[PDB]
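hey can u run this one w/ magnesium ion bound, need the structure tokens asap thx
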Amino acid sequence: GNVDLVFLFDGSMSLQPDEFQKILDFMKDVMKKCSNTSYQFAAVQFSTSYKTEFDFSDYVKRKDPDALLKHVKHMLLLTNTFGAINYVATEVFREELGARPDATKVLIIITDGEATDSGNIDAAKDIIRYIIGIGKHFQTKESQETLHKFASKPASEFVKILDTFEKLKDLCTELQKKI
Ligand SMILES: [Mg+2]
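ok here u go:
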């Protein structure tokens, strides 16, 4: 029943300060609701570059989402989603970072725009992948559909297109129900 969950969250230049803070608050809320469970967490900010803001070992030690994220600095650059997902798959889901070999791997990708880079995410395909596309850049169907390649199948389950986070059916509950 162990789940190792990574939040992979956009820090691009398009995010207003309140919008970036709402992404932080969303991750904290999921963690608080899912705390003291078989879930362990890590979080990675991506924009141009990728930074593990806290790893699974950190999570087990402090178990305080506000302290784990207190040092995050909004990167304010690009949206290199291909590089970021590869980074998570190969550099974050590792025993050296506290990941548990027995656990089910889950990736929650949070983004406010289309990917600026290119390539493939072969190395991450066996991870259960949800993508949340937040805000105005996903107002047309075409834009939304560009996120399907990053998510598990079917997109009707794994791609979430949101005006705001409050409209999402509660993620901790849904994960505990389904994973
Ligand atoms: Mg953006």
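The helical segments are 17-33, 56-62, 65-68, 81-92, 141-145, 155-158, 171-178. anyway lmk if its weird
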